[PDB]
Amino acid sequence: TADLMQEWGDAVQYNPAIIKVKVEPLYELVTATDFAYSSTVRQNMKQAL
Amino acid sequence: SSHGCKELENALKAASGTQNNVLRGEPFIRGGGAGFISGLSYLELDNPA
């Protein structure tokens, strides 16, 4: 019934799912501001991935 | 006296029926609360408006 569709759509605001995603590989977080040798760790991750 | 009969019947009753019934529709909405979006975009077949 269109009532439970309305109720579902209202509830979705508070507990939504992810419909479209755009992502970057996790190694782009390994940054010299956080980790020494960061370029080596990054390249390791690039291979491991 | 002599007598002779030959008697024949042949009957063909073919028939056929077909029905194709197709229904489509796509409400689309931008703006408004997600509950009202879902409650309106759900197609009520008796009132597509």
UniProtKB/Swiss-Prot annotation, chain A:
It is found in: Secreted; Target cell membrane. N-glycosylated; contains one or two bound glycans. Not O-glycosylated. It comes from the Eukaryota. Heterotrimer of 3 chains: alpha (C8A), beta (C8B) and gamma (C8G); the alpha and gamma chains are disulfide bonded. Component of the membrane attack complex (MAC), composed of complement C5b, C6, C7, C8A, C8B, C8G and multiple copies of the pore-forming subunit C9. Component of the membrane attack complex (MAC), a multiprotein complex activated by the complement cascade, which inserts into a target cell membrane and forms a pore, leading to target cell membrane rupture and cell lysis. The MAC is initiated by proteolytic cleavage of C5 into complement C5b in response to the classical, alternative, lectin and GZMK complement pathways. The complement pathways consist in a cascade of proteins that leads to phagocytosis and breakdown of pathogens and signaling that strengthens the adaptive immune system. Belongs to the complement C6/C7/C8/C9 family. It is linked to Complement component 8 deficiency, 2: A rare defect of the complement classical pathway associated with susceptibility to severe recurrent infections, predominantly by Neisseria gonorrhoeae or Neisseria meningitidis. This is Complement component C8 beta chain.
From Swiss-Prot, chain B:
C-, N- and O-glycosylated. O-glycosylated with core 1 or possibly core 8 glycans. It is found in: Secreted; Target cell membrane. Belongs to the complement C6/C7/C8/C9 family. It is linked to Complement component 7 deficiency: A rare defect of the complement classical pathway associated with susceptibility to severe recurrent infections, predominantly by Neisseria gonorrhoeae or Neisseria meningitidis. Component of the membrane attack complex (MAC), a multiprotein complex activated by the complement cascade, which inserts into a target cell membrane and forms a pore, leading to target cell membrane rupture and cell lysis. The MAC is initiated by proteolytic cleavage of C5 into complement C5b in response to the classical, alternative, lectin and GZMK complement pathways. The complement pathways consist in a cascade of proteins that leads to phagocytosis and breakdown of pathogens and signaling that strengthens the adaptive immune system. C7 serves as a membrane anchor. Monomer or dimer; as a C5b-7 complex it can also form multimeric rosettes. Component of the membrane attack complex (MAC), composed of complement C5b, C6, C7, C8A, C8B, C8G and multiple copies of the pore-forming subunit C9. This is Complement component C7. It comes from Homo sapiens. The lineage of its organism: Eukaryota, Metazoa, Chordata, Craniata, Vertebrata. The gene is C7. The chain holds residues 349 to 397 of 843 of the full protein.
